[PDB]
């Protein structure tokens, strides 16, 4: 039997599908960077996409751990074009901040229901979101200091292309 409420279950399932979209969005940023010839930035985005899938799968497994079931929904078509390298990363930061607020909404919902198990499960994503936002802000700071100079952009493209 399911030991999460149907509201909490739906919120977790909604977030799972939101995490799938996050993965798709970053792949679409890879398609942009590859079109612009920045294979290192594209590689970073491909790695980021795979990292979002592991986020989706940890929502996946917690739902089944609490006796729930996952239902996959349609994934909306992501943007595919940005006005420059910085515009794509600014869009990524705005998306991660939106993801953080979506995690907060589940946390507050689970808290109102005294679903302590789900509140505590979500804390990993709270801490992880602090990292994901910080890593994009750091990239944005390096792009702002580069100020469009291709010598510095090349060094950061190769650097982000070294992602593990």
Ligand X SMILES: CCCCCCCCCCCCCCCCCCCC
How far apart (Å, rounded) are the C-alpha atoms in residues 101 and 155?
33
Among 7, 10, 39, 57, binds ligand X (CB under 6 A): 57
The answer to whether the CB of 39 falls within 8 A of the CB of 163 is no
Contact 34, 136 (CB under 8 A): no
Q: Does 6 bind a second copy (CB under 8 A)?
A: no
Asked whether the beta carbons of 63 and 69 are under 8 A apart, the reply is: yes
- The answer to whether 105 is a known ligand-binding residue is yes
- What separation in angstroms does the CA of 86 have from each of 82, 89, 136, 140? 9, 5, 10, 7
Map residues 11-50 to x or -, x wherever contact with ligand X holds by CB under 6 A: ---------x--xx--x------------------x--xx
Where on the chain is the footprint of a second copy (CB under 8 A)?
A: 3, 20, 24, 27-28, 31, 34-35, 37, 39, 46, 57, 60, 62, 64-67, 69-78, 80, 97, 100, 104, 107-108, 114, 116-117, 120-121, 123, 126-127, 129-131, 133-134, 137-138, 141-142, 145-147, 149-155
């Amino acid at each position: 039997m399911m030991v999460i409420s149907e509201k909490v279950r739906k919120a977790l399932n909604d977030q799972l599908n939101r995490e799938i979209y996050s993965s798709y969005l970053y792949l679409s940023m890879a398609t942009y960077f590859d079109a612009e010839g920045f294979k290192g930035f594209a590689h970073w985005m491909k790695k980021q996409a795979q990292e979002e899938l592991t986020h989706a799968m940890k929502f996946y497994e917690y739902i089944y751990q609490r006796g729930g079931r996952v239902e996959l929904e349609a994934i909306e078509k992501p943007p595919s074009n940005w006005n420059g390298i910085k515009d794509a990363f600014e869009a990524a930061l705005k998306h991660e901040e939106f993801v953080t607020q979506s995690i907060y909404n589940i946390l507050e919902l689970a808290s109102e229901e005294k679903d302590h198990a789900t509140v505590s499960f979500l804390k990993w994503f709270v801490d992880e979101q602090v990292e994901e936002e910080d890593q994009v802000r750091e990239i944005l700071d390096l792009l702002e200091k580069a100020n469009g100079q291709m010598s510095v952009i090349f060094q950061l493209d190769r650097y982000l292309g070294q992602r593990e």
